[PDB]
Amino acid sequence: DCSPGIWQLDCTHLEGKVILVAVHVASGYIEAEVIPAETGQETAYFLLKLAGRWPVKTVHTDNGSNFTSTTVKAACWWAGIKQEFGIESMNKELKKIIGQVRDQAEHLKTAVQMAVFIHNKKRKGGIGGYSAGERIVDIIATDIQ
Ligand SMILES: CO[C@H](C(=O)O)c1c(C)nc2ccc(Br)cc2c1-c1ccc(Cl)cc1
Ligand SMILES: [As]
Ligand SMILES: [As]
């Protein structure tokens, strides 16, 4: 539905740890990472990874103060990203999926990536049938032509 370069990034906490979660809005495609806590440095770093892989043009968050450090503003500068001073939830969705897999993995780390994998792969409710992972790549290839 939305612009191909729009992404959302937020932190959740689970087991005393921080999971950083990026959602490509138009597809539902998630990428995630477990960090020991929220620091500008971790946020910048994660943006740098995301941007070297997708065309990121704008990043929205539900917590703006997340993006106030020089550190974060530099990553966004260097990579050509912008936010927006204003404005789901999958975050319900991802945790849920985490909850089903937790026993299968020793470290939250692993269980999260398992949950990310299940989410990106799941077949669209019915018709169409594309998974979040298939749609991201469709949107981005389609928007290249
Ligand atoms: C992400 O960690 C950085 C690093 O390893 O050098 C870092 C770090 C850790 N601190 C910074 C403080 C001010 C400014 Br401007 C940039 C940074 C930077 C920084 C260096 C390069 C880029 Cl593209 C973005 C940020
Ligand atoms: As965050
Ligand atoms: As930014």
Domains of the chain by residue range: 1-145
- Experimentally, how was this structure solved? X-ray
Q: 50: closest CA among 30, 74, 28? A: 30
The percent helix, strand, coil of the chain (3-state, each to 5) is 45, 20, 35
Euclidean distance between the first and the last CA atom of the chain, given in angstroms as a whole number: 17
- What does the alpha-carbon distance between residue 117 and residue 59 come to, in Å, rounded to a whole number? 22
Task: Tell me the three state secondary structure of residue 6.
Answer: strand
For the record, the structure tokens of 77 come out as: 């500068």
Give the integer Cα–Cα distance in Å for 27 and 8: 11
- As a dihedral over the C-alpha atoms of residue 63, residue 68, residue 73, residue 79, rounded to 10 degrees, the angle is 0
Q: Report which ligand 1 atom has the smallest distance to the Cα of 79.
A: 23
Angle at the Cα of 133 from the Cα atoms of 86 and 32, rounded to 5 degrees: 55
Spatial strand order of the sheet with 17-24 comes to 30-35, 17-24, 6-14, 58-60
Task: State whether the beta carbon of 101 lies less than 6 angstroms from ligand 1.
Answer: no
> Of all atoms in ligand 1, which is nearest to the CA of residue 75?
24
Resolution of the PDB structure in angstroms: 2.5
Domain 1-145: which CATH number of 3.90.550.10, 3.50.50.60, 3.20.20.300, 3.30.420.10? 3.30.420.10
Rounded to the nearest angstrom, the distance between the alpha carbon of 138 and the centre of ligand 3 is: 25
Question: What distance in angstroms lies between residue 74's CA and the mean position of ligand 3's atoms?
Answer: 8
